[PDB]
Symmetry: D3
Subunit: 167 residues, 6 copies
């Protein structure tokens, strides 16, 4: 029933390797900001750990084990504190980090909101069984991105993936 | 220390959408068969559930919810009974089902053996942080596929991913 | 130990088959509604609609509806910080029991609120329930405690006075 | 794949006390003892903890906290060690202990096999959604009780509950 | 991102009995009470369970099973409700209770903040690997105790233990 | 209940700093070696080598070595069906305690095998240890029980006779 205070703690998982992916993340935060059921949102790429012993760090480059552990754990920490996951899932370039986080969250029995995006709304609709069955709620990013602003994250109502070929 | 009987229960995760992926799986089973530390190996694509109410089933096609649940659960069942995971991980075509299973297994604190394969041993070596940090042991598929036959699955000795750019 | 804000997130599980059971549920919602340590309450029966289900209650239900409804409850269990169970000692609801075992396997606290209309029978309880529950509040004589119980910390209160089977 | 040594570790859950129920349990053991895939079977009612500090143990009595604690724990230990659960489920007199155990195992992602028994096959077939959905494989006690001797507990293939009204 | 309402639910673990230790705990509370990101703080020694059936409660005595059970459980409940753990860790007299609690929380994937205190800053700096690796963020009690008032418990950014010998 | 094959998978945790501690560990391995209910035993100190570490015991260790070694233990905890702890009551090993809490959060059984060289002091134990452990075998007077204990089912034996703090 109606909550006394916002309780949703969103773990916003998302690729961040292209302008389009980056714009979706931006857009997602905005909508989430308009949702009255949200108490907090964590985006893994917002802050960052800095390793002093790490001289001249580069992206996609070799990183120190210390930076790697700290950054990975901040993400797991985000998942731990989150009550649910929201994944801006690029269906054109499958992100394994996101897929990994979806499985982790489900192993913890946490609800997972999948928001698929494709630049080819007209190509075949197929999805991996693990993703298709692991997620508890699907919200198409192409045509319903906006309900993130209204979805009741206090209870995360289920909505099984349907309409996708399974492989 | 030395085990009285084999105790390793391997969950062999792997894409199965190309001849090359299919040959690796085949090869993997053979090596695993030669390993004295293995009590059992589960390959998700070996058996299969059959839904009677499912008329004319097709691969990649729309599947019944009953078949979807049963098949997904057989996989989770495999992960549950497994003591460790071994992933024939295609680095050229990232498989999200596999990535999902890697995260699930790690959320359960189970050791995960990553065996990466690439048809371009000469291209840049980069890996997602979640995969790079989530796996506990890496065995290159291109140059060490064969140690699967000797690895001590009774204890799954760690071997951190190194030599890969992190993104 | 004094919360800055209410944190208690209650999963209120109970059978919803008889009028009596529907009454208890009705009362609990109100009682918990007056507790200042509660941030939110979730009640399973407050549902999903399979647009493809041509559907009777108690009848054969589509797998899609079954999956979504079952998940909505587990999701309520996941979000909850504790469980409050309007537990029927006369008609044992295995669903409620399942959920109690699920929550405990998750290490979360479970407040057992038993009810009986047969005070005549020897008060007894299954071991798993007797030992699994962390806090018991008699529904026949302490129901009102739910409006005052501190769900921010859910103080323990082991089951006693019940014969074990 | 074929197991090198039996892998199934069964948690055999069942109500006792009722003459019929005891019979079921006894026959289940026999059936299981004949299954090559089973490595071990734990039945909670077999042996028990004796509280030396317990005067006159009343079976159904107001038993001491030490006995209760040790007995309850001996069951969780069995659930913990078990790879799968097999429940002799009485559809005539619902045993909440069993139900408890089923959800506990499912929260652990362990496979659960339901073997329902009814002395009233003429009565309506109904099942609580939590059981019907939580269970991973059903094997009708009244009709396929014998299957327990052939079921491959090394993989516990799933068989979704069906044909039951759901309330 | 910025939280809409305090999200941090702290499990404040610490040894008691020792005059110094009590002081630490008292100051930690003050510091925490000043942190805007904190929603609630649970300290195991604050209030307690009273076993009406317990004659003359001996603090350090052979306490009854009911008291023990209710007290131990009240702590797990706090760990369960908590989003993160903050441990006032005595490097001079290792408290195994605290250690227990740290591993329990890590098995749950919850973030753990170590605040080490030593009355002998001249002695060698060493730490048991399990603590040094299990801990997700360290905040020197002797030097940065005040940080507890600024630390964003809505996300618990990590800070790997370093500068300690490991045995 | 009679295993077809040994299933017990033991995670043997203990401090490995003093000669005495190194002796107990030595004995346990042998005792467990005679138990027919055991399929395998894992002992943390039996290690990893960071080819890039130029390394002293107790010294500063590379993060890579730290990560791999720590993981090897958690992996041993994951594979194990139960834990056997050669627990020192004179010099509390927080590593062992951490691992005990980890295993219990995983619902696995933990056999506490305490040892003391000071029978003179009031036998006491921390609550979390006293309540977390599921089976206790006195290392000073029952050490040998480990060769006969049934690890296929690890029968419970709550801690008693210890004052609680
Ligand atoms: Br992936 C990935 N890469 C780099 N920084 C990160 N933080 C969180 N997830 C990250
Ligand atoms: Br993916 C995927 N697709 C089809 N069948 C499967 N079984 C296990 N995993 C599977
Ligand atoms: Br149980 C159970 N049975 C039927 N419908 C439900 N909705 C929520 N929980 C339910
Ligand atoms: Br007695 C006894 N022994 C083992 N498991 C049980 N569940 C309920 N009562 C039980
Ligand atoms: Br007393 C008491 N109360 C709460 N937590 C504790 N840990 C050890 N002893 C404790
Ligand atoms: Br603890 C601990 N400390 C140092 N080395 C180890 N290897 C295994 N467990 C260890």
């Amino acid at each position: 029933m109606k909550a006394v205070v916002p309780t949703g703690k969103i773990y916003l998982g998302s690729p961040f390797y292209s302008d389009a992916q980056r714009e979706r993340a931006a857009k997602a935060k905005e909508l989430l900001a308009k949702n009255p059921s949200i108490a907090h949102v964590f985006f893994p790429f917002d802050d960052g750990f800095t390793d002093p012993d790490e001289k001249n760090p580069e992206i996609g480059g070799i990183r120190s084990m210390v930076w790697r552990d700290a950054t990975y754990q901040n993400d797991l920490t985000g998942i731990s504190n989150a009550t649910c996951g929201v994944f801006l899932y690029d269906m054109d370039q499958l992100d394994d980090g996101s897929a990994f986080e979806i499985g982790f969250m489900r192993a913890m029995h946490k609800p997972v909101i999948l928001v698929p995006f494709t630049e080819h709304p007209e190509k075949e609709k197929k999805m991996n069984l693990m993703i298709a069955q692991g997620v508890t709620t699907i919200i198409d990013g192409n045509t319903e991105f906006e309900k993130l602003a209204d979805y009741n994250f206090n209870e995360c109502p289920s909505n099984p993936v349907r309409g996708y070929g399974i492989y």
